[PDB]
Amino acid sequence: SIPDIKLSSGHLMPSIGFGCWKLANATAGEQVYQAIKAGYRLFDGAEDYGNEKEVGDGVKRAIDEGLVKREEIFLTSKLWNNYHDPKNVETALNKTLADLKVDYVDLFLIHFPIAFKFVPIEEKYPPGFYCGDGNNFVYEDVPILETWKALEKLVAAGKIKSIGVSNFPGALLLDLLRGATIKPAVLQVEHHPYLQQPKLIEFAQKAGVTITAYSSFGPQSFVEMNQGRALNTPTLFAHDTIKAIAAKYNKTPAEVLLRWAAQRGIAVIPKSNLPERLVQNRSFNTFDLTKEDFEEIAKLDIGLRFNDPWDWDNIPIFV
Amino acid sequence: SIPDIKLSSGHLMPSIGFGCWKLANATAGEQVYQAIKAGYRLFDGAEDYGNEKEVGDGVKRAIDEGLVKREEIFLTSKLWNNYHDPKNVETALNKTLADLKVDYVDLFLIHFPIAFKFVPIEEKYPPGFYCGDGNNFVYEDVPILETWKALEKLVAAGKIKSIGVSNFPGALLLDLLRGATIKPAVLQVEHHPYLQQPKLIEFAQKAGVTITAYSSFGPQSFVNQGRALNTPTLFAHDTIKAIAAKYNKTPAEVLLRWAAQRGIAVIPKSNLPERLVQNRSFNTFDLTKEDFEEIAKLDIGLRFNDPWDWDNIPIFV
Numbered sequence: 250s251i252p253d254i255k256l257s258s259g260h261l262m263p264s265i266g267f268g269c270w271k272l273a274n275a276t277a278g279e280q281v282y283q284a285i286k287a288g289y290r291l292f293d294g295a296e297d298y299g300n301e302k303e304v305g306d307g308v309k310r311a312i313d314e315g316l317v318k319r320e321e322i323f324l325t326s327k328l329w330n331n332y333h334d335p336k337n338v339e340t341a342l343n344k345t346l347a348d349l350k351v352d353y354v355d356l357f358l359i360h361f362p363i364a365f366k367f368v369p370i371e372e373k374y375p376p377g378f379y380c381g382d383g384n385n386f387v388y389e390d391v392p393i394l395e396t397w398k399a400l401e402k403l404v405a406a407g408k409i410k411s412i413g414v415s416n417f418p419g420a421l422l423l424d425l426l427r428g429a430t431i432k433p434a435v436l437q438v439e440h441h442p443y444l445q446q447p448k449l450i451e452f453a454q455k456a457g458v459t460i461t462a463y464s465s466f467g468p469q470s471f472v473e474m475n476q477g478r479a480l481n482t483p484t485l486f487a488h489d490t491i492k493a494i495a496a497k498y499n500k501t502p503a504e505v506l507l508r509w510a511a512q513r514g515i516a517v518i519p520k521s522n523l524p525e526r527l528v529q530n531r532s533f534n535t536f537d538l539t540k541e542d543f544e545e546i547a548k549l550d551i552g553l554r555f556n557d558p559w560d561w562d563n564i565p566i567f568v
Numbered sequence: 569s570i571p572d573i574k575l576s577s578g579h580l581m582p583s584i585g586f587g588c589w590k591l592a593n594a595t596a597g598e599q600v601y602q603a604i605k606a607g608y609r610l611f612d613g614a615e616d617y618g619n620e621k622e623v624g625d626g627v628k629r630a631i632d633e634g635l636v637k638r639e640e641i642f643l644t645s646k647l648w649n650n651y652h653d654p655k656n657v658e659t660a661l662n663k664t665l666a667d668l669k670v671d672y673v674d675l676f677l678i679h680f681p682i683a684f685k686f687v688p689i690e691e692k693y694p695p696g697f698y699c700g701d702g703n704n705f706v707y708e709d710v711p712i713l714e715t716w717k718a719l720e721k722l723v724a725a726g727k728i729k730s731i732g733v734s735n736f737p738g739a740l741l742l743d744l745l746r747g748a749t750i751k752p753a754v755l756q757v758e759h760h761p762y763l764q765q766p767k768l769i770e771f772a773q774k775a776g777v778t779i780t781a782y783s784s785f786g787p788q789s790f791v792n793q794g795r796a797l798n799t800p801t802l803f804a805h806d807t808i809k810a811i812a813a814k815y816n817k818t819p820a821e822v823l824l825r826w827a828a829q830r831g832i833a834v835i836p837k838s839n840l841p842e843r844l845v846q847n848r849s850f851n852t853f854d855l856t857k858e859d860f861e862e863i864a865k866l867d868i869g870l871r872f873n874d875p876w877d878w879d880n881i882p883i884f885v
């Protein structure tokens with residue numbers, strides 16, 4: 250049912266996966282397991298999510314029960330900001346591998362083109378915004394390419410199958426493509442009708458980089474974090490454009506939001522604590538948005554970004 | 569008169585300069601010379617402008633006539649897109665030096681974070697968008713930092729006083745800063761009330777990078793581009809007029825002052841002598857917080873110089 254996408258690395262990646270951000274440690278293992286039973290095969294995690302051990306527990310349970318074999322699960326993780334210095338990259342990957350209880354991750358991404366000062370794992374993990382000095386942000390002078398070469402070596406050592414990046418704007422991705430020996434296979438970015446960045450999508454896809462969309466439901470994911478920008482934003486779920494299209498096909502607004510990306514070759518990783526939403530978030534490929542529908546949804550693009558490092562410490566990633 | 573700005577390199581840079589883009593070759597020498605007599609000391613040029621030889625004649629004439637000495641003139645040039653590969657960087661710079669008839673340039677900027685396939689100087693100069701294969705754009709795998717290191721080397725060789733970048737978005741500048749031994753001293757970007765990019769300015773200034781604004785008059789500079797032609801003029805914008813008529817200054821003087829008062833260098837260019845004068849003496853009034861607030865409302869992120877138009881190059885996306 251779930252179409253696979255061919256990555257530039259020579260490996261297949263499910264076009265629909267299960268998001269793990271803000272999956273409570275207490276119920277994550279069980280929800281990952283239920284997701285596998287519901288047919289999900291790709292799991293989008295990260296060291297920063299702090300629940301990789303639980304994600305691993307869920308996968309290991311499914312494997313121990315004979316529902317799936319390791320090779321049938323696509324595990325994505327992300328290298329956090331404090332670990333860009335080459336000498337720390339493998340250490341961070343090792344922690345991820347140990348927590349996930351596996352020998353390799355299918356996809357490992359540079360979480361952000363941001364290098365926080367290294368913080369020893371036994372000092373605090375996941376470190377979040379901690380940089381070794383109270384609440385102050387401290388950075389390291391590690392160019393992206395240095396981190397990328399450390400990742401390329403880990404691919405050669407068999408610990409990572411495919412490598413890619415997240416939160417990279419066009420000029421940065423373009424430059425990485427110039428110095429990379431193993432081209433980044435995936436660009437994972439915030440993508441929803443309020444932030445469509447059509448030119449980025451076009452450039453990346455023309456360059457052979459697969460797009461994975463995150464926060465496909467826009468502000469939704471951020472309101473529980475009490476983010477003001479998101480709370481002030483009208484939901485996509487109650488938006489007249491999305492609702493009119495959903496009604497026309499007799500689909501849910503969530504299905505239209507996910508299909509709007511899937512139909513354009515963009516991979517999705519919807520997240521949900523609700524069992525009822527598992528099947529739904531993975532079975533939306535039952536109708537086709539017309540040229541007209543796309544023109545209508547295109548009108549909602551306003552460049553509204555919910556995940557912006559500028560908010561953390563005026564980091565100029567998207568400026 | 570014209571305030572100087574101390575660059576992160578230690579060297580000083582006039583805050584008001586004379587732009588050389590489109591200065592016709594037949595009269596560029598004379599215009600640069602007249603500009604020097606008019607008080608200008610910084611000349612913003614580029615290999616791509618194709619008139620460095622003539623800009624050089626102008627400066628050489630002012631020096632031979634004893635109006636100025638080489639070290640009182642600040643020359644800026646820019647490394648064009650076909651010369652990013654380190655093995656070609658010095659070739660391009662040597663051509664700029666031979667053309668300007670100088671032993672070094674004061675500021676050498678990476679013109680665009682774009683690497684076109686190398687085309688020999690002898691094959692075509694300036695190459696412009698020609699990449700050695702008909703009208704097709706062809707690129708080279710040369711990371712920004714490799715080009716930068718070649719420039720740092722040319723600084724140690726004494727051929728360049730300060731180095732910097734142009735048309736670099738925030739993320740790219742941030743990354744270059746992590747790898748630079750000599751920090752880029754300047755960030756030259758399009759900057760006007762319709763494209764204010766305040767967060768980029770704030771980040772750059774805070775990192776110690778000096779901003780040089782170009783196209784200070786917005787749409788007035790690309791007018792045969794449709795985008796610019798179909799954009800309401802800033803010279804007739806109600807907010808600009810209001811502030812200009814409120815200080816008895818021209819709209820042009822308000823547009824330049826808005827940048828200058830914020831520590832941003834400007835490089836206006838006028839074929840007309842009167843304006844030539846106007847453009848170097850607009851620091852005769854201050855904008856109030858309220859003025860800035862009203863001007864800041866014009867920001868719509870409208871960009872006239874976008875590589876996306878050339879070949880869907882993702883520099884600003």
Ligand SMILES: NC(=O)c1ccc[n+]([C@@H]2O[C@H](COP(=O)([O-])OP(=O)(O)OC[C@H]3O[C@@H](n4cnc5c(N)ncnc54)[C@H](OP(=O)(O)O)[C@@H]3O)[C@@H](O)[C@H]2O)c1
Binds near residue numbers: 268294466518521
């Ligand atoms: N690399 C990065 O920077 C980055 C940043 C953010 C996210 N990501 C990744 O991408 C994933 C997805 O993004 P996200 O978690 O931010 O947000 P999302 O998937 O857009 O989140 C959807 C929000 O909508 C609700 N929801 C889920 N299915 C729904 C449905 N069918 N109908 C109505 N509401 C529904 C969920 O609530 P319930 O849980 O109560 O169902 C959740 O609060 C993450 O889990 C993570 O793996 C990566």
Ligand SMILES: NC(=O)c1ccc[n+]([C@@H]2O[C@H](COP(=O)([O-])OP(=O)(O)OC[C@H]3O[C@@H](n4cnc5c(N)ncnc54)[C@H](OP(=O)(O)O)[C@@H]3O)[C@@H](O)[C@H]2O)c1
Binds near residue numbers: 781782783784840
């Ligand atoms: N790095 C880059 O990518 C880049 C890109 C573009 C430009 N630049 C540099 O920055 C400079 C700025 O570009 P530009 O020359 O097109 O922009 P500009 O100097 O802002 O152009 C102003 C236009 O307005 C007119 N003008 C000048 N002064 C005036 C005044 N006081 N009152 C009314 N009209 C006035 C001029 O025509 P008249 O001559 O008839 O008065 C000129 O056509 C260039 O020369 C170049 O050195 C760099």
